[PDB]
Design a protein around this ligand. Structure first.
Ligand SMILES: Cc1cc2nc3c(=O)[nH]c(=O)nc-3n(C[C@H](O)[C@H](O)[C@H](O)COP(=O)(O)OP(=O)(O)OC[C@H]3O[C@@H](n4cnc5c(N)ncnc54)[C@H](O)[C@@H]3O)c2cc1C
Ligand SMILES: Cc1cc2nc3c(=O)[nH]c(=O)nc-3n(C[C@H](O)[C@H](O)[C@H](O)COP(=O)(O)OP(=O)(O)OC[C@H]3O[C@@H](n4cnc5c(N)ncnc54)[C@H](O)[C@@H]3O)c2cc1C
Lengths: 462, 462
């Protein structure tokens, strides 16, 4: 029967747990329905297991500069199993920590699958057991999208990021299909570690929604790293040969004639084409809750759905798909609800983001074209530099560091910082803080530099 | 005879060159007297050659986590020569670049040693040739201090940072004497690379002028890295045995009786006790230019000496001894002089600094005690965290990451950020920009985090 609480959170991922923590910490009676493992996508099959795999690739990369630094080289041969077993243990330790905090904060964990009922007042049922609350948050997140046989015959022969983390040996030949961050990172980890990789993109470059400098630089650094970027190409079908897979792909460079080619002996085919929300089995239809054509839950600036007492945050909304954003919104909400801060909402402007490619990308703000459109070419001035990290001053293998700064108006307010280079992963957080206080280039320029670093380049751009 | 210019800069180091560049770029007729190699301390025997040696040590460190990441280990044996020859070539390329820019900007380079004359109007002479200008800047910098036989007999048997960069093989047994940044860095590079090292400090910990957390953490990380910290100890004398050196050191832990011990078979004895200014051979006495008891040139908030038309910037003044500060002040000055910005002066508050120890230290602002004294215990709240970088979640060897944030007053204005951990070298510049705009913790806290990174810890401190 309906057990009542002050807050019912559906899904124990990033947004979910943060909302429940802050909420209870403000005196509420929360419970967290979760059908699988706490932590959600991020911890089990995302941010965490990705970062470890990346570090591993970073080790692979630098093995290349060993002799250069005076040390003897190493015979090579990465063992995937060893690092996988560990990566996995780590994730378990994290899970144990998560349950611990939840219980330590007195938050129930209704285990199982939640779905709204055919009751007048918002109510959900988990195993014939119904629970209701004056405030219910849907934080079910999303999932990897795979193409159906109904369009790409043999599409179901390939894997997704989820099956990537399930992989137990280093694939011989990998084919990534997708041109966004997840694709790029998978492309780069797999390649660094030894697999022959082809990244299949429908256009000429990657991370197309990122500033032109970033997508342009990133496509190059990828190519220079041993990755094959198959431009203007898609898969028509996949067949399970005896050797491996046979990717029949259509490559149609605009201005030429289309040309089909088979990719044989493929060990792995990763679909990194998108993320579809987790909303169908919630019975959103039972309450007449608004979704878009793609299943995402439509919410307002304050995470409100169209139904009173029901909110949604994170991936499931289809906006700014990142652990920190789900957390930031789940937190702002618990405060708005249980602390009565009517204006407690997350600002989706100037959200910082790091893409763990090689070298790592960092970005916060408007791309130059996003500024030119919002301000006008007369009001947008960019500053940029392209240099080689001194780490490479003694190595044969090189990478670059390109940093761009989009300034707007007379005072030259920094509206966008984009870079890619070594250390760009830890370099970003602070400038992201500065970009949020409304810093102008002079604020950056009246900051005594730190020498010798790559960061100082941003405060001496001229 | 006296050739006249608009600006005469004495010394082509960090402060010197920046002042001349900006100056000429503003239409002046500059010349740069330099008795040695352009770039000064930093480029030839400082920032640059240090950073390369550090990167090298960082490679050594991570060689330790190779098998952990699934790769086979390496037999070891670093070759110093290889990396030294390279480090050196690099520095040459830099020198060539420096002359190039100077000439490209039409700045003369009077080669030789400058010294003021016995002329009424400020005039200097370089090789019986006299040159004068309405504005003369002394940017001679400083030099390593060594103890004289007159106190420490055999003191002249050891070397300094300068002789460190002259070293051609990896010393077998090194003894660093000094408890400040240069000492620590030399201690850590030499140790990472394979030398048995002892850091001799007159107290219990290092970097004593840094926030207590930093000096405390740093002394530990050093000890945990294979470095021997000889606390409460000094050298009484050094003798050249046949094997190597014999350091007779007095160790006097307060609360015990003093105990002398010999350190035998020492390959290297590095004096990292201090930096004395380059002012004696300038003939400062000829114009009655004010110096302090230690030879430093006394200047005001605007770099003015007590003599009209003569200024001083950088190490030679004995304040905030860093390349970026000399640059920042030489630049502010050229603008004040040639652009008539009467208030163009450098703010020595919130100068950021990175110490390249292992892991790297970063700091900007007031130490907690500097705030408690300036504000009062009732008005100072600190926040801190101590965690292990996830890079170590799979390694046996660990390091920590400790970050402290000193907040002041009701709004909790961030007056000091101190940390030590991996990536703390590139992490600092941005927070340094934020700390200068007068950011409050809420500004930091209303900054969507970047996950998974070490930096995010600073914007989620609670
Ligand atoms: C590869 C890969 C790498 C990523 N890397 C990063 C990165 O480095 N940085 C970053 O910031 N973001 C990263 N992301 C994005 C980040 O993972 C997501 O933004 C974050 O997971 C979003 O959280 P959420 O709260 O919306 O959902 P989720 O964490 O997905 O959580 C939803 C939880 O609810 C459960 N559930 C679903 N429906 C129900 C229901 N009906 N009843 C009960 N329980 C239910 C789910 O099992 C799940 O555990 C990555 C994603 C992938 C895939
Ligand atoms: C080891 C080591 C590491 C360092 N590392 C760093 C670091 O990583 N980061 C950092 O920011 N700072 C570092 N420093 C500090 C930085 O090097 C100095 O702050 C910077 O060099 C200061 O510049 P300056 O303009 O005062 O002098 P300098 O660069 O020393 O230059 C003075 C120049 O003037 C010449 N000269 C002197 N007297 C005369 C005269 N009478 N006539 C003609 N020419 C003359 C000198 O030859 C010299 O080249 C380091 C120092 C050492 C030693």
């Amino acid at each position: 029967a309906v057990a009542s609480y002050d807050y019912l959170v559906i899904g124990g991922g990033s947004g979910g747990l943060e909302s429940a923590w802050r909420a209870a910490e403000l005196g509420a009676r929360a419970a967290v329905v979760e059908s699988h493992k706490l932590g959600g996508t991020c911890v089990n099959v995302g941010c965490v297991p990705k970062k470890v795999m990346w570090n591993t690739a970073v080790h692979s990369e630098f093995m290349h500069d060993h002799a250069d630094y005076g040390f003897p080289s190493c015979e090579g041969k990465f063992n995937w199993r060893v690092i996988k077993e560990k990566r996995d243990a780590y994730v378990s330790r994290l899970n144990a920590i998560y349950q611990n905090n939840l219980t330590k904060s007195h938050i129930e964990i209704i285990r199982g699958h939640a779905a709204f009922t055919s009751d007048p007042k918002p109510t959900i049922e988990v195993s014939g057991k119904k629970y209701t609350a004056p405030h219910i948050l849907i934080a079910t997140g999303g999932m990897p999208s795979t193409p159906h046989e109904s369009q790409i015959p043999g599409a179901s022969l390939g894997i997704t990021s989820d099956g990537f983390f399930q992989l137990e040996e280093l694939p011989g030949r990998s084919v990534i299909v997708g041109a966004g961050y997840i694709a790029v990172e998978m492309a780069g980890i797999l390649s660094a570690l030894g697999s022959k990789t082809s990244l299949m993109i429908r256009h000429d470059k990657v991370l197309r929604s990122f500033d032109s400098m970033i997508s342009t630089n990133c496509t190059e650094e990828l190519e220079n790293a041993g990755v094959e970027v198959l431009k203007f190409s898609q898969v028509k079908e996949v067949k399970k040969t005896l050797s491996g897979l046979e990717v029949s792909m259509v490559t149609a460079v605009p201005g030429r004639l289309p040309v089909m080619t088979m990719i044989p002996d493929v060990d792995c085919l990763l679909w990194a084409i998108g993320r579809v929300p987790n909303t169908k089995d919630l019975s959103l239809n039972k309450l007449g809750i608004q979704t878009d054509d793609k299943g995402h839950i439509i919410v307002d600036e304050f995470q409100n759905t169209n139904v009173k007492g029901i909110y949604a945050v994170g991936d499931v909304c289809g906006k700014a798909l990142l652990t920190p954003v789900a957390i930031a919104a789940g937190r702002k909400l618990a405060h708005r609800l249980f602390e009565y801060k009517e204006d407690s909402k997350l600002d989706y402007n100037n959200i910082p983001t790091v893409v763990f490619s090689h070298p790592p990308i960092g970005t916060v703000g408007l791309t130059e074209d996003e500024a030119i459109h919002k301000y006008g070419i007369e009001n947008v001035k960019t500053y940029s530099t392209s240099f080689t990290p001194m780490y490479h001053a003694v190595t044969k293998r090189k990478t670059k560091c390109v940093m761009k700064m989009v300034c707007a108006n007379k005072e030259e307010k920094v509206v966008g910082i984009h870079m890619q280079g070594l250390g760009c992963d830890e370099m970003l957080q602070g400038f992201a803080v500065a970009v949020k206080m409304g810093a102008t280039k002079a604020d950056f320029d009246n900051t005594v530099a730190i020498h010798p670093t790559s960061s100082e380049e941003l405060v001496t751009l001229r």
